[PDB]
Write a protein that holds these residues in place. Sequence first.
Motif, PDB file in Angstrom:
ATOM      1  N   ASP E 296      11.796  32.882  30.004  1.00 28.99           N
ATOM      2  CA  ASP E 296      12.849  33.370  30.906  1.00 28.99           C
ATOM      3  C   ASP E 296      14.235  32.880  30.499  1.00 28.99           C
ATOM      4  N   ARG E 297      14.304  31.758  29.796  1.00 23.76           N
ATOM      5  CA  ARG E 297      15.584  31.093  29.579  1.00 23.76           C
ATOM      6  C   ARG E 297      15.835  30.728  28.107  1.00 23.76           C
ATOM      7  N   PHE E 298      14.911  30.004  27.477  1.00 21.27           N
ATOM      8  CA  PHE E 298      15.197  29.515  26.133  1.00 21.27           C
ATOM      9  C   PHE E 298      15.164  30.592  25.028  1.00 21.27           C
ATOM     10  N   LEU E 299      14.111  31.381  24.985  1.00 18.92           N
ATOM     11  CA  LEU E 299      14.060  32.455  23.976  1.00 18.92           C
ATOM     12  C   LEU E 299      15.233  33.444  24.113  1.00 18.92           C
ATOM     13  N   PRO E 300      15.617  33.803  25.353  1.00 21.18           N
ATOM     14  CA  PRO E 300      16.839  34.629  25.407  1.00 21.18           C
ATOM     15  C   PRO E 300      18.085  33.909  24.882  1.00 21.18           C
ATOM     16  N   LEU E 301      18.136  32.587  25.023  1.00 22.69           N
ATOM     17  CA  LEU E 301      19.254  31.826  24.459  1.00 22.69           C
ATOM     18  C   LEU E 301      19.247  31.868  22.920  1.00 22.69           C
ATOM     19  N   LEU E 302      18.086  31.651  22.330  1.00 23.89           N
ATOM     20  CA  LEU E 302      17.916  31.833  20.880  1.00 23.89           C
ATOM     21  C   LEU E 302      18.503  33.176  20.387  1.00 23.89           C
ATOM     22  N   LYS E 303      18.196  34.262  21.089  1.00 23.62           N
ATOM     23  CA  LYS E 303      18.708  35.593  20.711  1.00 23.62           C
ATOM     24  C   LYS E 303      20.190  35.626  20.880  1.00 23.62           C
ATOM     25  N   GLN E 304      20.655  35.075  21.996  1.00 27.84           N
ATOM     26  CA  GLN E 304      22.079  35.022  22.264  1.00 27.84           C
ATOM     27  C   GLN E 304      22.851  34.356  21.148  1.00 27.84           C
ATOM     28  N   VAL E 305      22.364  33.229  20.635  1.00 24.46           N
ATOM     29  CA  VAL E 305      23.108  32.565  19.571  1.00 24.46           C
ATOM     30  C   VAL E 305      22.870  33.218  18.207  1.00 24.46           C
ATOM     31  N   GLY E 306      22.023  34.257  18.156  1.00 21.40           N
ATOM     32  CA  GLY E 306      21.878  35.067  16.944  1.00 21.40           C
ATOM     33  C   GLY E 306      20.638  34.866  16.090  1.00 21.40           C
ATOM     34  N   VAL E 307      19.563  34.355  16.690  1.00 17.96           N
ATOM     35  CA  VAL E 307      18.309  34.228  15.980  1.00 17.96           C
ATOM     36  C   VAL E 307      17.590  35.546  16.078  1.00 17.96           C
ATOM     37  N   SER E 308      17.109  36.059  14.951  1.00 15.21           N
ATOM     38  CA  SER E 308      16.545  37.405  14.944  1.00 15.21           C
ATOM     39  C   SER E 308      15.183  37.452  15.630  1.00 15.21           C
ATOM     40  N   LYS E 309      14.790  38.650  16.036  1.00 18.64           N
ATOM     41  CA  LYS E 309      13.499  38.860  16.660  1.00 18.64           C
ATOM     42  C   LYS E 309      12.365  38.506  15.725  1.00 18.64           C
ATOM     43  N   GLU E 310      12.579  38.767  14.432  1.00 22.80           N
ATOM     44  CA  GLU E 310      11.581  38.457  13.413  1.00 22.80           C
ATOM     45  C   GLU E 310      11.453  36.947  13.233  1.00 22.80           C
ATOM     46  N   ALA E 311      12.576  36.247  13.201  1.00 25.36           N
ATOM     47  CA  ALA E 311      12.529  34.788  13.116  1.00 25.36           C
ATOM     48  C   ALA E 311      11.751  34.233  14.334  1.00 25.36           C
ATOM     49  N   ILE E 312      11.976  34.832  15.496  1.00 25.10           N
ATOM     50  CA  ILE E 312      11.302  34.384  16.710  1.00 25.10           C
ATOM     51  C   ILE E 312       9.811  34.685  16.680  1.00 25.10           C
ATOM     52  N   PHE E 313       9.423  35.839  16.112  1.00 21.73           N
ATOM     53  CA  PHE E 313       7.999  36.163  15.934  1.00 21.73           C
ATOM     54  C   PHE E 313       7.295  35.151  14.989  1.00 21.73           C
ATOM     55  N   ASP E 314       7.954  34.793  13.895  1.00 21.31           N
ATOM     56  CA  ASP E 314       7.451  33.716  13.062  1.00 21.31           C
ATOM     57  C   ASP E 314       7.233  32.432  13.896  1.00 21.31           C
ATOM     58  N   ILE E 315       8.256  32.007  14.627  1.00 22.60           N
ATOM     59  CA  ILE E 315       8.190  30.703  15.308  1.00 22.60           C
ATOM     60  C   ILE E 315       7.033  30.652  16.302  1.00 22.60           C
ATOM     61  N   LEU E 316       6.852  31.728  17.052  1.00 25.30           N
ATOM     62  CA  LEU E 316       5.836  31.810  18.095  1.00 25.30           C
ATOM     63  C   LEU E 316       4.440  32.189  17.620  1.00 25.30           C
ATOM     64  N   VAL E 317       4.369  33.058  16.613  1.00 27.51           N
ATOM     65  CA  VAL E 317       3.083  33.676  16.248  1.00 27.51           C
ATOM     66  C   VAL E 317       2.663  33.379  14.791  1.00 27.51           C
ATOM     67  N   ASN E 318       3.496  33.755  13.810  1.00 35.60           N
ATOM     68  CA  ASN E 318       3.093  33.603  12.399  1.00 35.60           C
ATOM     69  C   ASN E 318       2.988  32.161  11.921  1.00 35.60           C
ATOM     70  N   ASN E 319       3.966  31.351  12.289  1.00 29.87           N
ATOM     71  CA  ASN E 319       3.940  29.957  11.883  1.00 29.87           C
ATOM     72  C   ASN E 319       2.739  29.207  12.456  1.00 29.87           C
ATOM     73  N   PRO E 320       2.455  29.357  13.774  1.00 27.68           N
ATOM     74  CA  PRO E 320       1.273  28.637  14.297  1.00 27.68           C
ATOM     75  C   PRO E 320      -0.064  29.126  13.710  1.00 27.68           C
ATOM     76  N   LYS E 321      -0.132  30.430  13.431  1.00 27.14           N
ATOM     77  CA  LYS E 321      -1.280  31.046  12.770  1.00 27.14           C
ATOM     78  C   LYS E 321      -1.515  30.428  11.373  1.00 27.14           C
ATOM     79  N   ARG E 322      -0.432  30.037  10.695  1.00 31.45           N
ATOM     80  CA  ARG E 322      -0.528  29.342   9.408  1.00 31.45           C
ATOM     81  C   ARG E 322      -0.881  27.856   9.606  1.00 31.45           C
ATOM     82  N   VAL E 323      -0.050  27.110  10.334  1.00 28.50           N
ATOM     83  CA  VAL E 323      -0.246  25.656  10.412  1.00 28.50           C
ATOM     84  C   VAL E 323      -1.499  25.210  11.170  1.00 28.50           C
ATOM     85  N   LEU E 324      -1.998  26.014  12.095  1.00 28.82           N
ATOM     86  CA  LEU E 324      -3.182  25.612  12.855  1.00 28.82           C
ATOM     87  C   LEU E 324      -4.498  26.090  12.216  1.00 28.82           C
TER      88      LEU E 324
END
Lengths: 351, 351, 351, 351, 351
Positions: E296-324
Amino acid sequence: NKFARTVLGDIPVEKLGITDCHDHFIKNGGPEVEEHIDFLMLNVDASIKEFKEFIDRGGSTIVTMDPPNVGRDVLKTLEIANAVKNLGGNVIMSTGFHKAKFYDKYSSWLAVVPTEEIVKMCVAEIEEGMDEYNYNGPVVKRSKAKAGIIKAGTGYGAIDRLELKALEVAARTSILTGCPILVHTQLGTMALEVAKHLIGFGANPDKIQISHLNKNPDKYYYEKVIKETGVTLCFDGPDRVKYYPDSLLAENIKYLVDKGLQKHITLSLDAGRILYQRNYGLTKGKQTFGLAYLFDRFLPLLKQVGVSKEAIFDILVNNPKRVLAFDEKRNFDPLKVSKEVLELKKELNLN
Amino acid sequence: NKFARTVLGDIPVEKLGITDCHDHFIKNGGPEVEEHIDFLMLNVDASIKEFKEFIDRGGSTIVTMDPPNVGRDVLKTLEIANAVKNLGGNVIMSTGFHKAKFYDKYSSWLAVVPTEEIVKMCVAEIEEGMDEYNYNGPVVKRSKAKAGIIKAGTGYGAIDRLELKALEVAARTSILTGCPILVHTQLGTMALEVAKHLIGFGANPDKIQISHLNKNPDKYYYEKVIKETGVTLCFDGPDRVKYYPDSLLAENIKYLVDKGLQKHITLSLDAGRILYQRNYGLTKGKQTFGLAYLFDRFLPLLKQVGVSKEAIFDILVNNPKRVLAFDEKRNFDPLKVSKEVLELKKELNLN
Amino acid sequence: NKFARTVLGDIPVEKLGITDCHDHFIKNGGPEVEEHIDFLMLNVDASIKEFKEFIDRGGSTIVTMDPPNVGRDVLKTLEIANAVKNLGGNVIMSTGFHKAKFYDKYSSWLAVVPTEEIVKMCVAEIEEGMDEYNYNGPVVKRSKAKAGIIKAGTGYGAIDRLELKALEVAARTSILTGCPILVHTQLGTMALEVAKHLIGFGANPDKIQISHLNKNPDKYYYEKVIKETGVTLCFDGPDRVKYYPDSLLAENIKYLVDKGLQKHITLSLDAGRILYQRNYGLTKGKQTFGLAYLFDRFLPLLKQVGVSKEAIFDILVNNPKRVLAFDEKRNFDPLKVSKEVLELKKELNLN
Amino acid sequence: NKFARTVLGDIPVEKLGITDCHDHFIKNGGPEVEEHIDFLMLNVDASIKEFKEFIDRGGSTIVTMDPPNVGRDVLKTLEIANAVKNLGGNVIMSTGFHKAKFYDKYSSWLAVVPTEEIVKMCVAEIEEGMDEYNYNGPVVKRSKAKAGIIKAGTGYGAIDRLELKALEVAARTSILTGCPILVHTQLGTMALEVAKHLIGFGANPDKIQISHLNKNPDKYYYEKVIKETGVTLCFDGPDRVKYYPDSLLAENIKYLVDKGLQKHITLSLDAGRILYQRNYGLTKGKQTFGLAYLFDRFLPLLKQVGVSKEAIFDILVNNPKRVLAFDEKRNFDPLKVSKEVLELKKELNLN
Amino acid sequence: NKFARTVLGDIPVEKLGITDCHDHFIKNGGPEVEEHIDFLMLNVDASIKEFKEFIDRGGSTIVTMDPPNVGRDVLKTLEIANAVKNLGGNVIMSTGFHKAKFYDKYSSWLAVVPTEEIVKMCVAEIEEGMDEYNYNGPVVKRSKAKAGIIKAGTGYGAIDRLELKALEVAARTSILTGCPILVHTQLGTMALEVAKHLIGFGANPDKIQISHLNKNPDKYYYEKVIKETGVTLCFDGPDRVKYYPDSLLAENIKYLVDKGLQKHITLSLDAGRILYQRNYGLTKGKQTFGLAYLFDRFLPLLKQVGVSKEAIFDILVNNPKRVLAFDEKRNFDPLKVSKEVLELKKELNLN
Ligand SMILES: [Zn+2]
Ligand SMILES: [Zn+2]
Ligand SMILES: [Zn+2]
Ligand SMILES: [Zn+2]
Ligand SMILES: [Zn+2]
Ligand SMILES: [Zn+2]
Ligand SMILES: [Zn+2]
Ligand SMILES: [Zn+2]
Ligand SMILES: [Zn+2]
Ligand SMILES: [Zn+2]
């Protein structure tokens, strides 16, 4: 021709009168105040008023037991002594040291300065004049007032190496100047060993008082310390209910008197917190007891439990007349130091 | 023909080399140790090993900022200086005072002894020799080693009357002996006012460092202090994450250099806790960073954010060579003290 | 045609002038003093002096944000107001509540008394007169002086159920009387939700200030709160280095101004500890900054980072003139409270 | 024709039966709970179970000594009383005050509200009904239940000026309503002075109980207080080993009985921490003693040490029937207050 | 064909979905709870509701980072996992250790038991099943649920010798089983060294996450750690204003993404105190933020400061799928441990 050394000069011992052998008026900062604000006591006006109550009740002399580095205030105490002098009041002040807990074990002068040098400094307060800066630092400014007793202190259930050092300092200074000694024990522990060490160094048992035995209410122990060493037990305890009731001390004093030991007991209030004097209490908006309590409540309790007028007169007048009198000066001879003491100094790395 | 005063002797300032302007090795008890056991640092071997990593990395000189009554140990610090002297290591020691928090406000010598007499005592440490007993009592035994800087300290968001007294002491001593001055600020507060008072007393801004501005990471304030008073800001802060990340100090320094203020910046680690040095850390069974981190991590970070090698060379070498150089001596005239300072002293009851 | 309600009576809002929107002079006992002795501020003379320095710099109005049960002293605060009235000084006092941490959660009147009865008591302070006994018991004695704002407070990272209740008290009292509201947030957390709940209750965003956002230095958050709710951010922060440097506040305010939000910012010192005022600082033997620092140091910093004269004029004059102006009285309709607020009240067991 | 005032109405004193003169069941928040979570006691069911054990052993009446601002809970205590009324149980509640430490010395209503007004508020709890909101703010909502005794308290080794104020409130309220008085002393200190002041104000010694003498185990003092003033000593102490062993209390009570003083003693458990009741103990998963211990263990120990069955009957039944009985109402006459009390009030700044 | 090891079994990594890489629900006692009651978290129903909000916002997997000796509750966490499995929720639990502060340095099993034996125990939890008794004594009762990650922890500004041991344990367990590793750093310190050490032991950087870098907001440091070692930084920080504002983390993430490092970042709330979840907050009568705030708050802030949707998909989904994802099992060869690591083990006395 025996004398006691008061801040206003030497007096014949017959002028001591009724003597409170361990008390306070001014505690100007220092490590004790660090522990609790109630130890800060800075009111000359309230102190004078309390001293006058003590005099009103019959008292004359108060020995203020603050060593230079723990609360002592020469200038303000001199104000008090001068205010009550025309009334017959006497103040004896102290040189020496408190227990180790109050000195930095790493870098304090007690820890670092050779014993012989510390002795010279305590001798100087007995014979030349007290430092008005209370040996707080490298600058000294001596008063014309001299100290008339030296103090040392021991900690809870242990005599620290630095405390054995201070005891050596007390003993040598007493040996050299003739001055009396009084020792703070913590909860009345190690009293026997304190006396033994002082005597082992060469001190005269006749000049030794040990304070706070009231906090270790063991009548057998009291009698042991007195009979084995000949020192004098200075009791505080009246109106200190968080430790022990008045009745407990009254009955232990009765025991000692019944055992013929009345010449080895002195009394004090040790009113060294702000709420332990009446006038100081008033400055804090409180009704409290102080020096008059000794006469209004405790001495009557002594009589009630069966201590004679004669023994009370020894406690208040004759005993202090003896223990506070200066001895003749002597040379200190290291070769007279007991083996028990020398072996302990070696065990405690003091040489 | 300028010199710096090291514990082993005066050296031409060209021999200072890369200089850590505020650090520690031995903290031998004292008031700071009271706050936390980690302030207790008593290991010469650990200290020497750490000094050797500093030297291995290019360093030569460390200014140990312990004033006599707060942790200073002349004997042990001399052991350390002698162990590295042949590697070209130099140690400068300090006289003076710390912040008022560390002195008894009632009865300490800072509170009670006249400024004039304190100045005499600090001058003697700069010109005759430091007290091996660190001015912690009335017996003084001077070392052959002399102090080469004088310290003062201010508390959080306030300059206490006793800290103003120590600042006058620092300014007077500096004026009389030519020695440099370094002032501890608490969280980098009152830095402007410290500078102003010292100058108002007549001290030379060229001889003044102010430490800990890194804890008030305000680039505008840094610039204000330097431009308005001409003093030098000695930064610690590398590897102090509980306060601020290394990046912030790097960027604030970059800003000052860009503003043309590179000659007004010195560096230090201020490793005044046992886990702030690598070798000490190993004695408590931990891997920790220490003096080598300056070179291995922080200077590379400076380069990375865009500080030039020349600016870095001023910070480490030329600035210290200037601010640590003794000044020509002067007499102190009290009538030349600034009106702003005179008014403050009156307001704080110092005269 | 608007008024502000000062302790000496209602004034045309044009008479407010430069206004300090959150500050203190007298803090007489209470829960805060329990946390630290520095919160005890009892000196009328020192307060008046500080107030005069504020006026000398151009200030006129100071809003003392002390709710009745936390430090408020009507009598002494009126003495200050009367001392400065002829200088054009104004004082606005507060009714209402602090954060829940300051109220017994079991048995305090906040916890136990029905909301409607608490509302009547706060209305009464706005409309009949403040209790000279500050609502600290069952006996009430009303002053002629009325409060002219109501406070509520929220704690760290949480709005406590009693805090939601105090928010309801604030909204109802403001709706009924037209008075302004100021909310303390702890470290600037929950500010958005405070704003939303008050508006949810029916309060006018135009009357609402929220304090201490400076302790959550998040420019995007500041902007979010303002744009989504229309309330006013009252910043303190100058000379509060243990939190954040002056520079950070300045730049965040420059950000808000650049985003067109300059009408939603007020300023304050919140000098609510004894060392946070110059003249109080003198009473404790220290040099400290106080109210003048706003004009001497912080406002020039605002200019230096590029905040326009108009924006500064709004922050200091126009915005306080708007947010402190009384609204037209309304009735409170409970069936009109927002569904979000109703659901939260159920969740927190408030019906 | 004497009555006692219970929360369920006035009863003939013959229906008091065996009476626990100082105890607790509910402590809802307040300053004590701030000291230790263990003082928080909120369980009606556990309290009713404990009350039933007390009744099962032969008890009937329990005086709950919570003054309005310290822990008192009218609603829940009434639940308890109603649950045991058909079993013969009686509850008496208190108005008045605790020791000064539990009230803000600057801003509490005890400190600030005129004595006469406080008296009105305490008379109202005795004669109209207790405030269900416990005088914790400006809104009052009276219960039908009235208080049947008034409390005051004194602190450690001192009577604070505010405590002398509460004692005057207690004396006046008792004179006006006829209600009995019970005074908490801290560690059993100042008991004699409490008695003399209450009497000095004009209170009936026959109405006065003083609690906690058990914590100052001085048989001579107990005797002095009783003989000089005629008050009654309400002891607690059973199963409070961290203070003193049961055996000490038993023997002191035997002493008092032997001296003819058995009519001046009452008993209580003062079970005011959560682990001081069996059923409360169970809620925290612990086996603990509570009210039944009085009968199971302490009374048999009294017989064992030789206290007569008559003295025990007096202590549990007769003495409470006397001290808890209402006097005829009187007018308070200020001119009748003793000179000692008047002089003390002057000394304490109380007019 | 990679899998992750949930408490309900191995799942295909494609089933991880949006993954919160460091969080908590149940903290059942242990050393943390000894620091603050707020660490006690015992409410399964509150935990479930919070998990369901997380899922409602789009989340699937939560890695609960409690090692066996610090708070872990296998039984209760299984209850939670079972309540949300049908909603596609996954729980991964942890073996291994926290920072040394939470283990007795003298006699804890980490201190005393040979590393090899500890590895066997941690391997057993990953491969046979976690101890339901949590390794808190000699009796073991294994769950069918296995741990899916191993933890280690480092302390403030230092890696304790026992932490190096636990890092060795982590590396060896990981090498032997293929399981991923996550390391708590204290204030984001020593992150670089943790990474180097684990790698020097032979662990795969691809399997390593380092937590809490958000508490050391140094963007250059973040980049160095990732660029030099290839590990992944698991940030918490949203709604932790007492440390740093959300905006700071958002900008530092934007930086890392702009440097091409988006594959090396994961997110988490680390809601390991009771007021850090919305539903838990409710059980304490407070409005608080929790898991939903991420969306509700932090991810929209990430977008606001200019982090791309793809970068956010990595952080939430692709990166954990790799490291775990589990690696293939390998052998541990102690002879292949880096010289740097061997050298440190010798210096820290670990042989
Ligand atoms: Zn003593
Ligand atoms: Zn004493
Ligand atoms: Zn410093
Ligand atoms: Zn330092
Ligand atoms: Zn506030
Ligand atoms: Zn405030
Ligand atoms: Zn009590
Ligand atoms: Zn009680
Ligand atoms: Zn962690
Ligand atoms: Zn965690």
